[PDB]
């Protein structure tokens, strides 16, 4: 359940790291650790919106 969204956002950060600039990478890691926080504290709404924002930064690096 939550680990699936964790996998999605972790994949997203891993691919943001391959071409993006330093600010994009730092924001991706920010979203990653915010996710990790929410997933440890059990809050599906948070992890979902963090996944949304991660796909959003991926769309920022078209």
């Amino acid at each position: 359940d939550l680990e699936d969204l964790l996998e999605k956002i972790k994949d997203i950060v891993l691919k943001v790291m391959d071409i993006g600039d330093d600010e994009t990478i730092k924001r991706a890691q920010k979203l990653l650790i915010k996710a990790e926080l929410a997933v440890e504290n059990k809050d599906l709404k948070e992890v979902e919106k963090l996944l949304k924002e991660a796909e959003k930064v991926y769309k920022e690096v078209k």
Partner: protein, 153 residues
């Protein structure tokens, strides 16, 4: 006690990435990593020290000197390689993941920015492989970690 301390460490790290500069966040992420290392082995005094050091960075966010960021990077490396010794009663997968993490820290110590990027991408990949139980890729990821920690030695 350890599960409530790593989370405060993560919170401090996020605030640092809000405030700090590339070297300071480099240090802080290395801290978070060796902290997770210590959590995997049951060493709580280490993680207490880690929270203390990260909060020290946060406090002296405009007075810390790159010389002492480097002292702490080297020290975090040494500590992670020492904590790896308590990881001999867990599955081979988490052991190789722990060694990968420690090598990533040692790269963050002396490696340049692009090398740290590569090491963090490989660390993420190892975090995925752990959830997939894939031995054949995390073994080669650890070997590629090794073909890096000395490549920048």
């Amino acid at each position: 006690n350890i599960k409530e301390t790593l989370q405060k460490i993560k919170e401090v790290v996020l605030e640092i990435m809000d405030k700090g500069d590339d070297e300071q966040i480099k240090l802080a992420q290395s801290l978070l990593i060796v902290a997770e290392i210590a959590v995997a082995v049951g060493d709580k005094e280490t993680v207490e020290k880690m929270y203390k050091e990260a909060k020290y960075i946060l406090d002296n966010i405009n007075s810390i000197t790159d010389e002492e960021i480097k002292k702490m990077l080297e020290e975090a490396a040494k500590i992670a390689k020492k904590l790896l010794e308590k990881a001999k009663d867990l599955p081979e997968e988490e052991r190789i993941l722990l060694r990968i993490k420690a090598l990533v820290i040692e790269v963050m110590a002396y490696g340049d920015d692009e090398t740290i990027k590569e090491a963090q991408k490989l660390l993420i990949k190892a975090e995925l492989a752990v959830k997939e139980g894939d031995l054949e890729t995390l073994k080669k990821i650890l070997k590629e970690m090794e073909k890096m920690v000395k490549e920048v030695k």
